[PDB]
Amino acid sequence: ELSERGEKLPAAQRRDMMWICRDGDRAKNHLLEANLRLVVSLAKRYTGRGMAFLDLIQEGNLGLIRAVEKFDYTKGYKFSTYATWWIR
DNA sequence: AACACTCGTCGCCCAGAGTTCACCTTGGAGCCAGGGACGGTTCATTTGGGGTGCCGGAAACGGACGCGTACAGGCCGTATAATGGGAGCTGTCACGGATGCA
């Protein structure tokens, strides 16, 4: 929003925003690397037909990306239950 | 064993078979002369008929044209919890050389 129709942002008001942006992206990454184990545990079951183990794993990884992007913590549910549907 | 009769065979002699040799007729075979009518040709009609180009238009007909419907394929989302694969079967030998360790 500040890019066009903004203000000459001072350093105190710019560096903090940049830092929190990087922090959020890093936290997202961290959750993904945490839950790849759930991804592989789910994808182990669909083997033996069509495509290979690693292809299934990477498709589950894409599904996990989608699940994290569309997750909602306010609902007070464990993340695994929501992510399983998207992985599948 | 002694004795007294009738029949082919031939020649000859006269008449015609039928054949030749050899005489008169007469229906010609055709040759030409003359006269149709005749069928092939040609040319006058003769209006009975074929003919037609185009259209008013009536109706089919071919298609455009606009606007509805139809599954096929695609996108999307599902909130207890569910957090590291089965399986592979492997009896070769020669052997040159790199090669990871010596």
GROMACS .gro file of C-alpha atoms (C1' of nucleotides) in nm:
model
  190
    1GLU     CA    1   0.000   0.000   0.000
    2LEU     CA    2   0.284   0.241   0.084
    3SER     CA    3   0.463   0.176  -0.248
    4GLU     CA    4   0.219   0.387  -0.452
    5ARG     CA    5   0.030   0.650  -0.252
    6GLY     CA    6   0.268   0.632   0.041
    7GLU     CA    7   0.524   0.848   0.217
    8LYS     CA    8   0.900   0.887   0.224
    9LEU     CA    9   0.925   0.626   0.496
   10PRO     CA   10   1.181   0.701   0.769
   11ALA     CA   11   1.431   0.432   0.858
   12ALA     CA   12   1.265   0.364   1.194
   13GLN     CA   13   0.933   0.298   1.018
   14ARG     CA   14   1.091   0.102   0.729
   15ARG     CA   15   1.354  -0.127   0.881
   16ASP     CA   16   1.112  -0.259   1.144
   17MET     CA   17   0.856  -0.350   0.876
   18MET     CA   18   1.123  -0.520   0.665
   19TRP     CA   19   1.247  -0.715   0.969
   20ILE     CA   20   0.900  -0.839   1.062
   21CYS     CA   21   0.840  -0.941   0.699
   22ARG     CA   22   1.159  -1.148   0.697
   23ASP     CA   23   1.071  -1.295   1.037
   24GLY     CA   24   0.729  -1.407   0.914
   25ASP     CA   25   0.871  -1.566   0.600
   26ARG     CA   26   1.134  -1.749   0.806
   27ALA     CA   27   0.868  -1.877   1.048
   28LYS     CA   28   0.664  -2.010   0.754
   29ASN     CA   29   0.971  -2.186   0.622
   30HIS     CA   30   1.035  -2.331   0.971
   31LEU     CA   31   0.687  -2.479   0.997
   32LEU     CA   32   0.721  -2.636   0.652
   33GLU     CA   33   1.051  -2.804   0.739
   34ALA     CA   34   0.893  -2.923   1.063
   35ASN     CA   35   0.598  -3.093   0.892
   36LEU     CA   36   0.770  -3.256   0.594
   37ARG     CA   37   0.778  -3.570   0.813
   38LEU     CA   38   0.398  -3.574   0.819
   39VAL     CA   39   0.408  -3.524   0.442
   40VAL     CA   40   0.627  -3.829   0.382
   41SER     CA   41   0.433  -4.038   0.635
   42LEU     CA   42   0.115  -3.964   0.439
   43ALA     CA   43   0.270  -4.013   0.094
   44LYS     CA   44   0.424  -4.353   0.179
   45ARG     CA   45   0.080  -4.512   0.128
   46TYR     CA   46   0.013  -4.417  -0.236
   47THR     CA   47   0.319  -4.591  -0.385
   48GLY     CA   48   0.332  -4.890  -0.619
   49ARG     CA   49   0.135  -4.741  -0.908
   50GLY     CA   50   0.204  -4.477  -1.171
   51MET     CA   51   0.470  -4.251  -1.020
   52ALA     CA   52   0.763  -4.292  -0.784
   53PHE     CA   53   0.815  -4.238  -0.412
   54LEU     CA   54   1.001  -3.909  -0.451
   55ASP     CA   55   0.741  -3.770  -0.692
   56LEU     CA   56   0.472  -3.850  -0.435
   57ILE     CA   57   0.682  -3.683  -0.164
   58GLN     CA   58   0.723  -3.363  -0.364
   59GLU     CA   59   0.352  -3.351  -0.447
   60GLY     CA   60   0.281  -3.382  -0.076
   61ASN     CA   61   0.529  -3.098  -0.020
   62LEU     CA   62   0.332  -2.879  -0.262
   63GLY     CA   63   0.014  -2.971  -0.076
   64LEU     CA   64   0.180  -2.873   0.252
   65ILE     CA   65   0.275  -2.536   0.101
   66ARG     CA   66  -0.090  -2.484   0.010
   67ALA     CA   67  -0.211  -2.595   0.354
   68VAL     CA   68   0.022  -2.356   0.536
   69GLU     CA   69  -0.079  -2.072   0.304
   70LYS     CA   70  -0.448  -2.137   0.382
   71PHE     CA   71  -0.413  -2.239   0.748
   72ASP     CA   72  -0.606  -2.058   1.023
   73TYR     CA   73  -0.482  -2.078   1.383
   74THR     CA   74  -0.783  -1.897   1.531
   75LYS     CA   75  -0.996  -2.210   1.487
   76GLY     CA   76  -0.794  -2.379   1.763
   77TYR     CA   77  -0.730  -2.703   1.574
   78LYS     CA   78  -0.415  -2.910   1.545
   79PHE     CA   79  -0.234  -2.833   1.221
   80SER     CA   80  -0.192  -3.199   1.123
   81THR     CA   81  -0.564  -3.259   1.075
   82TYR     CA   82  -0.601  -2.960   0.841
   83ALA     CA   83  -0.279  -3.035   0.651
   84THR     CA   84  -0.369  -3.400   0.588
   85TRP     CA   85  -0.662  -3.305   0.364
   86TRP     CA   86  -0.448  -3.073   0.152
   87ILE     CA   87  -0.165  -3.327   0.124
   88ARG     CA   88  -0.411  -3.593   0.009
   89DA     C1'   89  -2.119 -16.086 -12.542
   90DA     C1'   90  -2.371 -15.998 -13.023
   91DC     C1'   91  -2.696 -15.663 -13.260
   92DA     C1'   92  -2.991 -15.254 -13.497
   93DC     C1'   93  -3.167 -14.741 -13.394
   94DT     C1'   94  -3.224 -14.128 -13.255
   95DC     C1'   95  -2.971 -13.697 -13.097
   96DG     C1'   96  -2.568 -13.178 -13.112
   97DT     C1'   97  -2.329 -12.953 -13.433
   98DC     C1'   98  -2.231 -12.718 -13.785
   99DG     C1'   99  -2.304 -12.477 -14.189
  100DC     C1'  100  -2.599 -12.212 -14.462
  101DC     C1'  101  -2.993 -11.894 -14.600
  102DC     C1'  102  -3.334 -11.532 -14.554
  103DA     C1'  103  -3.531 -11.116 -14.282
  104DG     C1'  104  -3.472 -10.692 -13.985
  105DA     C1'  105  -3.207 -10.387 -13.542
  106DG     C1'  106  -3.085 -10.010 -13.551
  107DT     C1'  107  -2.737  -9.744 -13.718
  108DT     C1'  108  -2.516  -9.482 -14.023
  109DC     C1'  109  -2.528  -9.197 -14.417
  110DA     C1'  110  -2.769  -8.871 -14.571
  111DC     C1'  111  -3.208  -8.617 -14.823
  112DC     C1'  112  -3.615  -8.202 -14.712
  113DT     C1'  113  -3.902  -7.837 -14.392
  114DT     C1'  114  -4.053  -7.462 -14.010
  115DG     C1'  115  -4.072  -7.284 -13.588
  116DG     C1'  116  -3.791  -7.029 -13.501
  117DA     C1'  117  -3.406  -6.670 -13.159
  118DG     C1'  118  -3.334  -6.286 -13.199
  119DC     C1'  119  -3.293  -5.798 -13.398
  120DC     C1'  120  -3.511  -5.420 -13.473
  121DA     C1'  121  -3.926  -5.054 -13.473
  122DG     C1'  122  -4.280  -4.836 -13.240
  123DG     C1'  123  -4.573  -4.678 -12.838
  124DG     C1'  124  -4.715  -4.589 -12.405
  125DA     C1'  125  -4.750  -4.497 -11.872
  126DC     C1'  126  -4.470  -4.459 -11.502
  127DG     C1'  127  -4.210  -4.398 -11.165
  128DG     C1'  128  -3.853  -4.109 -11.058
  129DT     C1'  129  -3.768  -3.636 -11.024
  130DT     C1'  130  -3.851  -3.152 -10.934
  131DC     C1'  131  -4.086  -2.790 -10.793
  132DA     C1'  132  -4.533  -2.457 -10.665
  133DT     C1'  133  -4.804  -2.461 -10.210
  134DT     C1'  134  -5.015  -2.502  -9.689
  135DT     C1'  135  -5.115  -2.374  -9.312
  136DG     C1'  136  -5.065  -2.789  -8.899
  137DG     C1'  137  -4.716  -2.769  -8.633
  138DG     C1'  138  -4.272  -2.722  -8.363
  139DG     C1'  139  -4.087  -2.338  -8.068
  140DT     C1'  140  -3.930  -2.001  -7.725
  141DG     C1'  141  -3.768  -1.634  -7.406
  142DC     C1'  142  -3.906  -1.438  -7.069
  143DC     C1'  143  -4.184  -1.378  -6.650
  144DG     C1'  144  -4.613  -1.302  -6.277
  145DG     C1'  145  -4.551  -1.571  -5.954
  146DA     C1'  146  -4.617  -1.975  -5.655
  147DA     C1'  147  -4.390  -2.271  -5.402
  148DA     C1'  148  -4.001  -2.553  -5.270
  149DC     C1'  149  -3.528  -2.522  -5.087
  150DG     C1'  150  -3.094  -2.423  -4.949
  151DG     C1'  151  -2.875  -2.192  -4.610
  152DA     C1'  152  -2.764  -1.810  -4.295
  153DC     C1'  153  -2.834  -1.625  -3.847
  154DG     C1'  154  -2.934  -1.555  -3.386
  155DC     C1'  155  -2.997  -1.760  -2.963
  156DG     C1'  156  -3.081  -2.134  -2.638
  157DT     C1'  157  -2.889  -2.619  -2.403
  158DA     C1'  158  -2.522  -3.002  -2.290
  159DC     C1'  159  -2.178  -3.282  -2.106
  160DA     C1'  160  -1.627  -3.252  -2.052
  161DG     C1'  161  -1.287  -3.084  -1.859
  162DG     C1'  162  -1.103  -2.792  -1.503
  163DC     C1'  163  -1.072  -2.558  -1.035
  164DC     C1'  164  -1.173  -2.599  -0.555
  165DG     C1'  165  -1.253  -2.731  -0.099
  166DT     C1'  166  -1.335  -3.087   0.274
  167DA     C1'  167  -1.070  -2.900   1.053
  168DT     C1'  168  -0.991  -3.548   1.641
  169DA     C1'  169  -0.556  -3.710   1.507
  170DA     C1'  170  -0.371  -3.950   1.175
  171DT     C1'  171   0.476  -3.707   1.166
  172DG     C1'  172   1.118  -4.138   0.855
  173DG     C1'  173   0.954  -4.801   0.228
  174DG     C1'  174   0.943  -5.290   0.167
  175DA     C1'  175   1.226  -5.592  -0.102
  176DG     C1'  176   1.606  -5.754  -0.332
  177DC     C1'  177   1.836  -6.172  -0.412
  178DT     C1'  178   2.224  -6.155  -0.534
  179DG     C1'  179   2.617  -6.969  -0.839
  180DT     C1'  180   3.045  -6.612  -1.466
  181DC     C1'  181   3.475  -6.550  -1.615
  182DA     C1'  182   3.806  -6.338  -1.850
  183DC     C1'  183   4.053  -5.937  -1.717
  184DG     C1'  184   4.240  -5.400  -1.785
  185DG     C1'  185   4.262  -5.062  -1.545
  186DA     C1'  186   4.090  -4.689  -1.234
  187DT     C1'  187   4.015  -4.650  -0.787
  188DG     C1'  188   3.971  -4.532  -0.305
  189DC     C1'  189   4.315  -4.661   0.049
  190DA     C1'  190   4.769  -4.804   0.119
   0.00000   0.00000   0.00000
